[PDB]
Design a protein around this ligand. Structure first.
Ligand code: HEM
Ligand SMILES: [Pr+3]
Ligand SMILES: [Pr+3]
Ligand SMILES: [Pr+3]
Length: 157
């Protein structure tokens, strides 16, 4: 991660503003936008009964909120959140690939990145400071991808 200080200030101001939307926001809105980018993501996260699906989305938002909160508070050295992100990615390796209807692949996280970047634009902006969000989202989804791909490559087929 290489954010400039003006980028760090802008990201923190907009993030804390976004968190004002609710306990699990903006995480929930980010997941919902990924559902729009790719409805298969929704089919997977909402797999099962109405309750099960909603609980899974809630838990996803809860954990992502914690990881993001920690990352943003620690933009100076985020090794802890790096491990956490790789671990989260790792959790998407399932012996039966279509256990949840559609298999997980790294491309889903690229779509998630697009969804998240779109949301950041909704949260005194300049192109240079806004690029702080692009850096953060790329970092986050890259660590998720590495966690998943390293784990999936190692698993039996
Ligand atoms: C990119 C699209 C994503 C899809 C389609 C997806 C879907 C799923 C599915 C189907 C499971 C297995 C069912 C379950 O354990 O609840 C799971 C597990 C998990 N996911 Fe995701 N997820 C996505 C992104 C993320 C992200 C960004 C995070 C970051 C926090 C995350 C964190 C986790 C964790 C921690 C588990 C293990 C849950 C547990 O053991 O209770 N996922 N995910
Ligand atoms: Pr592990
Ligand atoms: Pr298999
Ligand atoms: Pr592992």
């Amino acid at each position: 991660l290489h954010l400039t200080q003006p980028q760090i200030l802008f990201v923190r101001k907009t993030w804390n503003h976004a968190r004002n939307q609710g306990a699990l926001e903006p995480a929930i809105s980010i997941f919902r936008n990924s559902f729009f980018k790719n409805p298969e993501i929704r089919q997977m996260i909402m797999f099962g009964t109405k309750n099960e699906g909603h609980e899974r989305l809630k838990k996803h938002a809860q954990l992502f909120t914690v990881l993001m909160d920690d990352l943003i508070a620690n933009l100076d050295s985020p090794s802890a959140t790096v491990a956490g992100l790789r671990e989260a990615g790792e959790k998407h390796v399932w012996p039966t690939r279509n256990q949840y209807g559609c298999p997980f692949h790294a491309h889903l996280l690229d779509q998630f990145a697009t969804a998240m970047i779109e949301r950041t634009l909704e949260w005194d902006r300049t192109e240079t400071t806004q690029r702080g969000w692009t850096k953060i989202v790329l970092f986050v989804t890259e660590q998720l991808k590495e966690g998943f791909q390293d784990e999936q490559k190692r698993a039996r087929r």
